[PDB]
Ligand binder design. Structure first.
Ligand SMILES: NC(=O)c1ccc[n+]([C@@H]2O[C@H](COP(=O)([O-])OP(=O)(O)OC[C@H]3O[C@@H](n4cnc5c(N)ncnc54)[C@H](O)[C@@H]3O)[C@@H](O)[C@H]2O)c1
Ligand SMILES: NC(=O)c1ccc[n+]([C@@H]2O[C@H](COP(=O)([O-])OP(=O)(O)OC[C@H]3O[C@@H](n4cnc5c(N)ncnc54)[C@H](O)[C@@H]3O)[C@@H](O)[C@H]2O)c1
Lengths: 263, 263
């Protein structure tokens, strides 16, 4: 009884997240690259806009989305002759030295049409200084509040660039982050198009490799691992306790995967 | 042929926005107040949280939502005995003197448990100064970009207070703003619960009056009026050209009323 119901829950979750079935062949990989580039281009055409905006963090998700975006606009310029199609990669410096070296390496991989650097530090500090609700907060809670402010102001910066340049904001959500709610609500969860949607983490990495990312970036690193999350998403064996945590986290974060609640 | 299809489009739009039928009686008005208070309380209970956060602008929409929120938590404290239930009204000063007098009058009407003031000016300025994409922008476009930055940083501030205090962010969207996309995407459009959803503008005002708002605030003020928008939402007669603009604007803003696009 318990096994069968758990199997049905897993299948319902995979369907709700549009999980992509495991890649069985190189045709599968190439077809997903082509489909996701065409999706990005369709979003531009349907919006009447010509620019794409994405923050490049150094991690594999924004690297993969950035490679798709840059290929998308190169193809659009070739086919349409319209030189206004442009991808703007946004450098959002913080203070993780490994991430910043990786951010530079990611940018060198993408070779985006344009790079813009936005220091959000002053805006984050200037907001935090005006929030009496931050006074006296327990340090662990304060660090999470401030971390979510940072994620949301990164979103504000990308939307400002998109607004100034007539663009769409790309987000990096995929199924392995979506199932756990591993994003900031209306922060990095907020975007106009999410071209990695439905992919397991290892599928994001497979696309990065096929798009020409160097190995060190392809494999760059709630009590559960991405390997366990991916197995869950694909209906493959995993520890029963890990599946229980994934299902519980999915339920608790459903509000992050739906529109605002209404009566 | 044209009339019948337009009628079907209007009906589909009203169904998609969950438009509330015109109030025929005082029972209708009181039932909607009770339902929307119960909705707010249900969102708190389902989330396990106790605090509500809302920016109070001086306009009738946040006044009405604020009155519902304050009644909601007063009832929760009475019924549960749990004094942690609290409504935090957020003052977000700008520089429209009429709005600021109206903001003070709105706060005096709500008598919220708590009031917090957040000056977002320094955060907005500090972000804008770091955006090279703002350099050389046409002034009209620049003013819209900056206005949307302001709307989004107001969202960031409310989410920070909610995060610090274990709360939910209330938004003020209703059907008359929703149908036109008259909000900033991931700005004032972003919230955890939208207790005015589905209401026509005149229905928001009717609830404000029934909740005890003074008349000057109840009636406080794309080429179409709210009276025309409300008639459209309720399937009542209106100028054919106004209906055409509403339908066109609805179509162009659909992306603002759906989750991020995915392949
Ligand atoms: N904040 C923490 O204490 C904490 C703990 C562990 C992990 N994280 C990680 O931090 C990142 C951001 O997640 P987060 O939780 O900090 O913030 P978030 O802002 O993404 O989500 C929490 C916010 O959602 C709203 N909310 C919560 N429950 C709701 C419900 N049932 N209905 C409607 N709205 C609801 C509230 O505004 C709440 O502050 C994620 O990667 C998460 O895994 C955070
Ligand atoms: N910005 C303007 O030029 C302008 C003109 C008239 C009215 N307004 C008013 O300003 C307020 C905010 O609206 P807004 O338009 O300024 O900004 P917004 O940020 O709310 O919406 C526009 C943003 O949505 C995205 N986008 C646009 N078309 C899309 C599509 N088809 N698919 C996916 N994403 C898409 C882009 O990021 C774009 O910058 C509203 O009240 C509106 O009525 C703005």
């Amino acid at each position: 009884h318990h096994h069968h119901h758990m199997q049905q829950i897993q299948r319902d979750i995979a369907q709700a997240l549009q999980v992509q079935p495991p890649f069985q062949s190189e045709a599968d990989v190439q077809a997903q690259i082509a489909r996701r580039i065409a999706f990005i281009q369709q979003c531009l055409k349907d919006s009447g806009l010509k620019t794409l905006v994405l923050g490049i963090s150094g991690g594999v998700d924004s690297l993969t989305a950035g490679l798709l975006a840059q290929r998308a606009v190169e193809q659009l310029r070739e086919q349409t002759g319209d030189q206004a199609y442009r991808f703007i990669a946004v450098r959002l410096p913080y203070q993780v030295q490994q991430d910043e070296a990786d951010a530079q390496a990611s940018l060198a991989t993408i070779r985006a049409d344009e790079e813009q650097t936005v220091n959000i530090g002053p805006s984050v500090k200037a907001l935090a200084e005006q929030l009496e609700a931050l006074e006296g907060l327990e340090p662990a809670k304060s660090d999470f509040v401030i971390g979510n402010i940072k994620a949301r102001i990164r979103m504000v910066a990308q939307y400002a660039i998109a607004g100034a340049r007539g663009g769409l904001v790309i987000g990096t959500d995929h199924a392995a982050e979506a199932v756990m709610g591993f994003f900031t609500k209306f922060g990095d969860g907020a975007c106009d198009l999410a071209p990695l949607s439905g992919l397991a983490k290892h599928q994001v990495r497979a696309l990065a490799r096929a798009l020409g990312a160097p190995e060190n970036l392809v494999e760059k690193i709630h009590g559960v691992t991405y390997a366990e999350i991916d197995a869950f998403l694909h209906g493959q064996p995993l520890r029963e306790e890990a599946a229980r945590v994934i299902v519980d986290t999915y339920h608790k974060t459903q509000h992050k995967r739906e529109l605002p609640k209404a009566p």
